[PDB]
Design an enzyme around this catalytic site. Structure first.
Site, short mmCIF file in Angstrom:
data_model
loop_
_atom_site.label_atom_id
_atom_site.label_comp_id
_atom_site.label_asym_id
_atom_site.label_seq_id
_atom_site.Cartn_x
_atom_site.Cartn_y
_atom_site.Cartn_z
N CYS A 46 0.81 -1.07 -0.05
CA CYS A 46 0.00 -0.05 -0.07
C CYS A 46 0.95 1.32 0.02
O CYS A 46 1.91 1.28 0.78
CB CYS A 46 -0.78 -0.13 1.37
SG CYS A 46 -1.97 1.24 1.45
N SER A 48 0.70 3.92 1.68
CA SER A 48 1.06 4.27 3.01
C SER A 48 2.22 3.54 3.85
O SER A 48 2.92 3.94 4.57
CB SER A 48 -0.11 3.76 4.02
OG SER A 48 -1.32 4.63 3.72
N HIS A 51 4.83 5.61 2.42
CA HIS A 51 5.02 6.83 3.18
C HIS A 51 5.78 6.47 4.39
O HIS A 51 6.46 7.48 4.87
CB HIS A 51 3.45 7.12 3.69
CG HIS A 51 2.93 7.68 2.60
ND1 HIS A 51 3.37 8.28 1.50
CD2 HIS A 51 1.28 7.87 2.60
CE1 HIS A 51 2.05 8.85 0.78
NE2 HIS A 51 0.99 8.39 1.27
N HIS A 67 0.54 -3.66 6.42
CA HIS A 67 -0.58 -3.65 7.31
C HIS A 67 -1.72 -4.23 6.24
O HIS A 67 -2.86 -4.58 6.94
CB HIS A 67 -0.85 -2.09 7.56
CG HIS A 67 -1.05 -1.48 6.43
ND1 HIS A 67 -0.10 -1.03 5.66
CD2 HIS A 67 -2.31 -0.90 6.06
CE1 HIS A 67 -0.58 -0.21 4.90
NE2 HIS A 67 -1.95 -0.20 4.84
N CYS A 174 -6.92 -3.36 3.46
CA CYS A 174 -6.72 -1.62 3.60
C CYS A 174 -7.43 -1.38 2.31
O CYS A 174 -8.26 -0.60 2.38
CB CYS A 174 -5.29 -1.55 3.66
SG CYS A 174 -5.32 0.42 3.92
N1 LIG Z 1 -7.62 7.00 4.67
C1 LIG Z 1 -7.00 5.50 4.51
O1 LIG Z 1 -7.69 4.63 5.46
C2 LIG Z 1 -5.96 5.27 3.56
C3 LIG Z 1 -5.41 6.06 2.82
N2 LIG Z 1 -4.37 5.67 2.00
C4 LIG Z 1 -3.61 6.70 1.28
O2 LIG Z 1 -4.40 6.84 -0.06
C5 LIG Z 1 -3.28 7.47 -0.99
C6 LIG Z 1 -3.49 6.54 -2.20
O3 LIG Z 1 -3.06 5.32 -1.89
P1 LIG Z 1 -2.77 4.20 -3.00
O4 LIG Z 1 -3.90 4.18 -3.91
O5 LIG Z 1 -1.94 2.96 -2.25
O6 LIG Z 1 -1.44 5.29 -3.57
P2 LIG Z 1 -0.92 5.04 -5.18
O7 LIG Z 1 0.50 5.95 -5.21
O8 LIG Z 1 -0.92 3.94 -5.78
O9 LIG Z 1 -1.92 6.12 -6.00
C7 LIG Z 1 -1.91 7.51 -5.78
C8 LIG Z 1 -2.04 8.14 -7.49
O10 LIG Z 1 -1.91 9.50 -7.38
C9 LIG Z 1 -1.50 10.00 -8.65
N3 LIG Z 1 -0.76 11.40 -8.51
C10 LIG Z 1 0.18 11.80 -7.50
N4 LIG Z 1 0.32 13.05 -7.75
C11 LIG Z 1 -0.62 13.55 -8.43
C12 LIG Z 1 -1.22 14.84 -8.45
N5 LIG Z 1 -0.48 15.97 -8.30
N6 LIG Z 1 -2.22 14.91 -9.12
C13 LIG Z 1 -2.89 13.92 -9.63
N7 LIG Z 1 -2.64 12.57 -9.38
C14 LIG Z 1 -1.55 12.42 -8.67
C15 LIG Z 1 -0.38 8.90 -8.95
O11 LIG Z 1 0.11 9.08 -10.23
C16 LIG Z 1 -0.94 7.61 -8.57
O12 LIG Z 1 -1.83 6.94 -9.66
C17 LIG Z 1 -2.13 7.43 -0.35
O13 LIG Z 1 -1.90 8.83 0.36
C18 LIG Z 1 -2.24 6.55 0.74
O14 LIG Z 1 -1.24 6.48 1.94
C19 LIG Z 1 -4.35 4.41 1.79
C20 LIG Z 1 -5.06 3.42 2.33
C21 LIG Z 1 -5.87 3.79 3.36
O1 LIG Z 2 -3.05 2.42 4.82
C1 LIG Z 2 -3.50 2.24 5.92
N1 LIG Z 2 -3.46 3.23 6.89
C2 LIG Z 2 -3.46 4.66 6.72
C3 LIG Z 2 -4.89 5.45 6.88
C4 LIG Z 2 -4.41 6.95 6.85
C5 LIG Z 2 -3.28 7.41 7.89
C6 LIG Z 2 -2.08 6.80 7.63
C7 LIG Z 2 -2.45 5.09 7.73
ZN LIG Z 3 -3.01 0.85 3.45
#
Ligand SMILES: NC(=O)C1=CN([C@@H]2O[C@H](COP(=O)(O)OP(=O)(O)OC[C@H]3O[C@@H](n4cnc5c(N)ncnc54)[C@H](O)[C@@H]3O)[C@@H](O)[C@H]2O)C=CC1
Ligand SMILES: O=CNC1CCCCC1
Ligand SMILES: [Zn+2]
Ligand SMILES: NC(=O)C1=CN([C@@H]2O[C@H](COP(=O)(O)OP(=O)(O)OC[C@H]3O[C@@H](n4cnc5c(N)ncnc54)[C@H](O)[C@@H]3O)[C@@H](O)[C@H]2O)C=CC1
Ligand SMILES: O=CNC1CCCCC1
Ligand SMILES: [Zn+2]
Ligand SMILES: [Zn+2]
Ligand SMILES: [Zn+2]
EC number: 1.1.1.1
Lengths: 374, 374
Positions: A46, A48, A51, A67, A174
């Protein structure tokens, strides 16, 4: 033959930020009261987890990250009642203690036992079950799935269907549940609505799946990597836009395209600027914008509160708003009944030993989800 | 008599910022097609009118301000179907055209014909009906009630009960409906909940009324003027706090008092810092915060989006979320049926000629609502 004993196994240890994971032997203590030791079968990469490497998400190092995973219970501590040895399980990065005010609330899911708001990198008792080179190693979000074995608190694990394919359903731990629930539970996307999804990775694709399941008429994917557009359309996007192609800010473009603003927008990237852009592009009187992406540690955005005063709703959520232990088994059951698909998210498979290649694929833009097999 | 003729009458003209209103003769043109000319009976002094004087709210000057009012139709232009000469009416500072996408949406109320987002200070047709000393004077929010007569567009006026007491129900034209609806319609306060209300003026007291009507168990008033607390408790506050009495930031105080955060908070002041404090004091997983106060022109707040990612909902609204022309007559009918009280908001009643004295009362902290009578 391992119950009650320390297990030596391989794990991916992160000793320092911005460095490759080190695949090496660790010692995994047996579970104490109300703890569960799990033999890991599959874990997804993921963003995250990345990160943690980059310092975007701060948690104590050295650490065993990971995770989003699934495995099989090896042993249980005293007093465990919800799982047994041999059960298939998904670790829960957001726990569900069942007892705090959030767990008792009909809508809340960010259980107060979480290790996100004030990270300690421990079990619930404030100690670690991992040693490497004789040194204690931190846990991550009460999960730590980049290891052949882990130990989790009972409130951080759910039993799932014994026939589940673990190499797919790990994503329910996740990314899939987060995106899907962000659309169907947090936003509550309506039939015939127009949605905008910023970020077309595994989580953003799962948001699209949820908007399509909710019956949205238009789903506009937004990404600066146009290689993400074909899969976005396959899972339900009706059109895709690259902000780099436009002379105007994309909130203006999206407002024009939607004849005055979208019904629902989602930030699924993790940038301060796109959180404000996503809010701006929903309709000013009745639009809803949901933050899903993780911001860089300790950084504040700047925004004009007139965006809200006109009538917009802005919210965020962890894990799609799902109460984790109640919801994960039900989502697995729905997957087994073909109610949603996970294969579109899985672009690469590697052995666990090739974890660093898996992170290279994510960073290069080439993958959606790489699944690591133990 | 007057119908079809220019009326010369008294009004309060604001020629430039940070000056007293000038009470002098103006000329009011007759209504054109789809316009209504109103003889004013009473108008309240809302803080938003003061924001025009102070430069907090930017709208073209010189202007006839005033927007919270009630009066009697003197004449109607061609094509008007919803009011007639002699009807009691309340002008609508947010119109309800009935035809735009917002008016058609079940939740939205910020009709796209409003003069707030891009203030022009005119009638819908782009012209003014007011002249003073030979110069054209701007309208304010399509209302302009600090005048013995005004002209409004039909979509900016609602007919109300012929038996209505106009010296009280003028408050339904802005401050009461805004605060009450912010609680009952926008936040949707729940029975047994804990609420925090920042700002205990006319609008914040109306928020308290709405929280009490919705069955909140605890309603914490917050104001730096402790003279506001007695009336807040009379209308439903269970306790009041003055931030100046505490060494810690009030968000921390309110979080402790509510055993981990309030269910609903309301910013009813108009300061960037209190908007962020009010968001922070709601519970991080399921709290809701509503912005009601007006920020100073063109200023951005700064906030950490983790406040939203954990699960909070942040929203704002104009006029309590009420669709204005549908709702104002029903709210007057509810008042006449004794479903809520307006007298607690009214601290002073003065002749219109004493408008500047009424603004001094507001600025000094001594009034809630002063009603000016014509
Ligand atoms: N709220 C929650 O529970 C969770 C949050 N996250 C967070 O969600 C986000 C997405 O996670 P994933 O899909 O695994 O990441 P990923 O990196 O696979 O997808 C992010 C996408 O954003 C695009 N991108 C980057 N910068 C950009 C910009 N300026 N404008 C437009 N598009 C842009 C990328 O090209 C990529 O396709 C991450 O920040 C992650 O940490 C992930 C899982 C759970
Ligand atoms: O990707 C899994 N968990 C994330 C949820 C958003 C804060 C950082 C951790
Ligand atoms: Zn995650
Ligand atoms: N959203 C909408 O539709 C409407 C918004 N408004 C806005 O709502 C706000 C409140 O309006 P009124 O009740 O008429 O104003 P008011 O001036 O009567 O009340 C404001 C209260 O805030 C208190 N206050 C000031 N600074 C403070 C601080 N730092 N901390 C705590 N308390 C503080 C004051 O002591 C006062 O009691 C204004 O900004 C006004 O423009 C008003 C009507 C409609
Ligand atoms: O008080 C009446 N209207 C207000 C609504 C919020 C912006 C400023 C004007
Ligand atoms: Zn809990
Ligand atoms: Zn309209
Ligand atoms: Zn007002």
């Amino acid at each position: 033959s391992t119950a009650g004993k320390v297990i030596k196994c391989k794990a991916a240890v992160l000793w320092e930020e911005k460095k490759p994971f080190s695949i090496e032997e660790v010692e995994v203590a047996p579970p104490k009261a109300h703890e569960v030791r799990i033999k890991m079968v599959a874990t997804g990469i993921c963003r995250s987890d990345d990160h943690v490497v980059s310092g975007t998400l701060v948690t104590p190092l050295p650490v065993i990250a990971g995770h989003e995973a699934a495995g099989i219970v090896e042993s249980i501590g005293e007093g465990v009642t919800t799982v047994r040895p041999g059960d298939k399980v998904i670790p829960l990065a957001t726990p569900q203690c069942g007892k705090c005010r959030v767990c008792k609330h009909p809508e809340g899911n960010f259980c107060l036992k979480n290790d996100l708001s004030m990270p300690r990198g421990t079990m619930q008792d404030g100690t670690s079950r991992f040693t490497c080179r004789g040194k204690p190693i931190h846990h991550f979000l009460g999960t730590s799935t980049f290891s052949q074995y882990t130990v989790v608190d009972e409130i951080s694990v759910a039993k799932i269907d014994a026939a589940s394919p673990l190499e797919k359903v790990c994503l329910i731990g996740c990314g899939f549940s987060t995106g899907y629930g962000s659309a169907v539970k947090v936003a509550k996307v309506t039939q015939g609505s127009t949605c905008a999804v910023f970020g077309l990775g595994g989580v953003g694709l799962s948001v699209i799946m949820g908007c399509k399941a909710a019956g949205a008429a238009r789903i506009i994917g937004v990404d600066i990597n146009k290689d993400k557009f074909a899969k976005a359309k396959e899972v339900g996007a009706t059109e895709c836009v690259n902000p780099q192609d436009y002379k105007k800010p994309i909130q203006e473009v999206l407002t024009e395209m939607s004849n005055g603003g979208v019904d629902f927008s989602f930030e699924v990237i993790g940038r301060l600027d796109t959180m404000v852009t996503a809010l701006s592009c929903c309709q000013e009187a009745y639009g809803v914008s949901v933050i899903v992406g993780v911001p860089p540690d300790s950084q504040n955005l700047s925004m004009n509160p007139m965006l809200l005063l006109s009538g917009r709703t802005w919210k965020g959520a962890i894990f799609g708003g799902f109460k984790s232990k109640d919801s994960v088994p039900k989502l697995v059951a729905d997957f087994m009944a073909k109610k949603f698909a996970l294969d579109p998210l899985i672009t690469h498979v590697l052995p666990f030993e090739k974890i660093n290649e898996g992170f290279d694929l994510l960073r290069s833009g080439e993958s959606i989800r790489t699944i690591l097999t133990f």
